[PDB]
């Protein structure tokens, strides 16, 4: 099989211009296709033979000679903020790489901790939930009763249509017998030169 | 006042670029559009058909425009040649150029192919008519035509050799499809392609551009030779074209028996061999497996034709022209059967290439030997004859230039229907079956049709025509 | 137009087998290679291709796991997946261009190889005795095996986080940043009934 890789899985992209790069493990002779996939939809063909469009808008162009290929947008729009794949059709085993565009925004994290409810404590459970609803970038969550713990399940939405910001939910599942030591703290580490800590006792 | 030997040499050299560009296009344009230009074969079929159909259409229109050309200070045919050469070589260079376009590359190739065909017509038709203006005496015109018909063969050989040995030196990688994924449990790891002077697709495109530049340089040099060494005489005898009389004489020629038979016969035979010329490079690459040595096969065929022209001249002067045309066209039939019935042996393919070159020499030499026996019969049958062989040729050229475009377009469309892989390592069984049919079924059918037309030949070689020649002594 | 109609979402078990259909319209199916793909929260993988009037070519990873079949009397293609457990993904059928090697048209059919079918449990996670301007509420939906639909009564500040696996069941959370708090309720919608709406109280 021939290796195909997109160096950036996520690309922050305002308007103006945006270039998505694809690198092949072999000299594929400009036999590279580009597909666009929107959430909840199958992949749609954009470019084939590294330069030729298939009924697409004129903003979607592509260049590349050998082992290095690029897909450019003359101007990014709201529909263009989707996932993009580069396929080879040089050899019989076909391979993809994966890449996505994201809008550009500012910064500023948030955090809020919530203890387990009485209904959950009644039916033999205790889930402590940390919400990080508005931030831009990548973030990490640490759970500390007295030492850092690795018993948490984490989920992330996409990017908001209005705020263009990300969220995160970290759930620490712990039984009634494991609810002994006491205080739980949720620590968030964004680009803010300091972890935001929300604690409960 | 005689026509100089150097003047005839320059006139003959001026006709080399037409045959060089024609042989290069007819032998390599399909594989350039399919494997080098990386076009969809539907678009390549459109390009080939439209280009040759425009080659034909523009032949009589440019002929009519040339008939109305006034005598300038440089001549009646020289201004057309001089003012058409640079645009023709520019369009020929841009035929084999691959543009960096997101869409409509087929439009680029259509525009430049049709422009080059128009300008090559604007070069050849005045050139073809120049032989009536170089000298007043008919013997000097015949000598210049012998020099030309001769070089014309040398130019086809030179163009085939140059294009094949330039674009064949620099190879390129090929596409492997699911049919080439025939080994997964074996997991063969013979990584030997990297240990080579790695050639790329851009190297193949550059080789095509270098071949085009060499052919364009030869075009310019031969046009300069034709302009400098040949001067029009401006003869007092200037017969009018009379286009209404031209159409009436065309109907008269098509109404004649032996003339129509010669046409149908040649037409079908040349159509079969033009179909072979079109879809033989792909047959060598993908059925015979000679993706690196197909240019050598084409060169061997051309050399065999050049060495078999005197053999067929001796055959027609010795054993007559009936059996000569009965066996020359049908000589390639057993070898066309044999190439598609053997597992692509190199010696068998080279022997069949030699035999096919011999058959091509016969098929494109013998009707010109038959033609005086038809001209004498037409002069006996119709005492009033003013430009009948010229329109007979025009009809033959137009119908060959249209039906060969139709055949090549249908062939490339059938390749698209069969699933031709764009520069594939191996074609699927449907594409190989189509390529076997396009060299062993359709050409054989066309050759059989032409042979059946040539059987119904009331001239019966000279056995009546010589008697008509006696009537030529009577009139 | 050339299009491909696929079977709906399938929910097999760990050691079952699943057959995915792909009806082809607008082109001769026997003239093209129909391809099957694999997308599991990641890039697109390549199981195999099938020529509907001939051979089948697999990837060595999916040999013995996938089996491609073609009914040319129905213009249909089938992908039969054997033993499961990590095959929960989206499978796209797409016919190849006869010349190039890329896929013009595409499909899409979900496969979820899990076990169980339970009713979700709703917990009103609330504040811990604090308030400053706007406050953040929540709703924890834990222990279901389908796709839920969480809504809030006319309030648009919600961030419904994607569901995650914990064992063999799914967990989900919702957060609403409401400034004024007279009364708020979390109403969930599940396929197996259980349209439970629980109010969020203080402390
Ligand atoms: C087993 C191997 C089999 C192999 C096949 C390779 C085969 C045939 C090669 C060539 C056929 C054409 C080459 C001979 C040129 C004849 C020289 C000549 O002087 O004769 C022609 C003259 O008559 C001009 O007219 P022509 O119509 O031929 O122009 C056609 C133009 N167009 C392409 C658009 C149809
Ligand atoms: C390696 C390439 C070698 C290849 C072999 C293929 C074939 C053997 C070719 C052989 C002899 C060349 C035949 C030339 C065809 C006639 C030349 C031509 O291409 O013809 C142009 C035309 O425009 C001028 O001659 P014309 O019109 O007068 O025809 C009537 C002739 N005449 C009136 C004197 C009876
Ligand atoms: C590897 C190669 C080794 C060796 C070979 C050496 C080769 C040279 C190759 C080629 C040049 C041969 C050119 C042969 C031309 C054939 C055509 C011919 O030789 O003759 C045609 C005939 O049609 C002419 O017509 P005609 O002479 O009657 O003139 C007046 C006609 N008309 C009265 C009606 C106006
Ligand atoms: C591709 C690049 C290389 C190209 C190099 C240029 C080569 C040019 C070819 C010249 C070949 C000369 O060809 C030769 O010329 C002499 C004249 O000297 C001719 O001479 C003969 O024909 C003429 C006309 O019938 C007679 O008057 C003469 O008595 C007779 O000897 C021959 O017909 C020919 O055999
Ligand atoms: C690629 C170009 C295609 C060919 C385009 C046509 C070229 C120009 C045609 C000129 C032919 C003769 O042109 C005409 O000659 C007669 C003389 O009899 C003149 O009287 C006309 O004023 C002149 O228009
Ligand atoms: C683009 C590729 C196609 C190439 C087309 C080339 C065709 C060229 C057409 C012929 C040239 C027409 O231009 C021509 O020039 C000469 C000037 O000497 C003039 O023509 C004139 O020449 C002399 C006087 O000089 C006289 O015979 C007469 O009065 C007239 O024919 C006209 O101006 C025009 O008839
Ligand atoms: C004597 C023979 C040798 C002559 C050598 C002449 C040089 C030939 C080299 C080819 C250079 C032309 O290269 C070609 O130019 C044109 C216009 O710029 C480009 O064409 C492009 O621009 C034009 C703008 O009008 C648009 O139609 C479209 O955006 C696209 O087609 C081609 O994408 C490019 O491939
Ligand atoms: C050196 C000279 C360079 C050549 C310059 C002129 C070349 C023009 C050829 C057209 C190239 C392809 O142009 C294509 O045509 C049609 C409509 O126009 C469309 O398809 C494409 O949008 C366009 O890219
Ligand atoms: C680079 C592009 C391709 C350019 C190719 C140029 C190669 C030039 C090599 C010489 C070709 C000319 O070849 C020429 O053919 C004719 C054949 O009838 C011969 O001409 C001969 O026959 C004619 C007519 O019967 C008589 O005038 C005389 O008997 C004699 O001249 C010449 O003797 C020969 O010199
Ligand atoms: C009268 C004028 C016309 C003259 C016609 C002949 C002139 C040119 C002769 C060159 C013939 C070259 O002959 C041959 O060409 C091919 C490709 O170029 C090359 O062939 C070489 O590479 C291929 C690679 O598969 C193999 O067949 C082998 O390794 C070797 O033969 C060599 O170069 C030469 O073996
Ligand atoms: C009259 C007959 C004229 C014969 C002229 C023949 C000359 C042929 C020139 C071939 C020179 C090849 O030149 C080489 O080609 C390969 C093809 O990709 C290129 O790569 C190289 O960069 C280039 O140096
Ligand atoms: C009398 C002798 C006649 C000899 C005539 C020879 C002239 C042609 C020589 C071939 C040189 C071609 O040079 C070659 O051109 C092409 C484009 O034009 C370039 O190709 C470049 O341009 C385009 C940009 O869109 C890309 O498709 C390509 O990936 C890129 O590499 C090559 O980088 C360059 O190496
Ligand atoms: C940059 C590209 C250009 C490169 C050109 C390279 C090849 C150049 C060679 C051209 C051939 C020269 O040809 C030479 O021209 C003179 C013209 O004075 C001609 O000489 C003869 O021409 C005609 C013949 O009908 C007579 O009217 C004239 O009286 C006579 O002198 C000869 O045919 C030849 O001696
Ligand atoms: C103006 C005339 C132009 C000259 C060129 C015309 C030559 C004819 C082109 C070749 C087309 C035949 O090409 C061949 O035909 C057979 C049917 O007979 C077809 O065969 C294909 O389709 C049939 C279905 O009907 C399948 O059963 C078979 O397995 C498959 O190979 C393909 O189309 C092709 O393999
Ligand atoms: C005048 C005789 C006409 C014969 C024309 C040639 C037709 C031959 C019939 C072959 C039918 C099947 O052709 C098959 O194609 C596949 C291509 O993958 C080859 O492999 C087989 O060896 C061949 O048998
Ligand atoms: C002599 C005149 C000839 C008739 C005039 C030409 C009419 C047709 C013009 C082209 C119209 C569409 O062209 C035809 O349709 C499909 C789109 O469905 C095109 O597209 C097809 O090939 C491309 C790749 O090359 C694929 O990306 C695409 O998925 C596929 O459908 C083809 O390029 C062609 O087969
Ligand atoms: Na000719």
Author numbering:
A (entry chain B): 1 to 201
B (entry chain A): 33 to 507
C (entry chain C): 1 to 203
Text lifted from the article:
Mfsd2a is the transporter for docosahexaenoic acid (DHA), an omega-3 fatty acid, across the blood brain barrier (BBB). Mechanistic studies revealed that Mfsd2a is a symporter for Na+ and is selective towards long chain, unsaturated fatty acids including DHA (22:6), α-linolenic acids (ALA, 18:3), and oleic acids (18:1) that are covalently tethered to the zwitterionic lysophosphatidylcholine (LPC) headgroup. Like other MFS members, drMfsd2a is comprised of twelve TMs that pack against one another with the substrate binding channel located at a cleft between the N- and C-terminal domains.
We expressed and purified drMfsd2a from SF-9 insect cells and discovered that the protein copurified with endogenous phospholipids. We therefore modeled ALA-LPC into the four distinct lipid-like densities termed Lysolipid1A, 1B, 2B, 3C (numbers and letters refer to the lipid and LPC binding positions). Initial data processing yielded a 2.9 Å resolution map with three lipid-like densities representing three merged ligands, Lysolipid1A, 2B, 3C. However, our in vitro analysis indicates that there is only ~1 phospholipid per protein molecule, suggesting that the lipids observed in this model is a merge of particles of substrates bound at three separate sites. To gain more accurate assessment of how drMfsd2a coordinates these ligands, we plotted the intermolecular Lysolipid2C- and Lysolipid3C-drMfsd2a interactions using the model for the merged ligand map at 2.9 Å resolution.
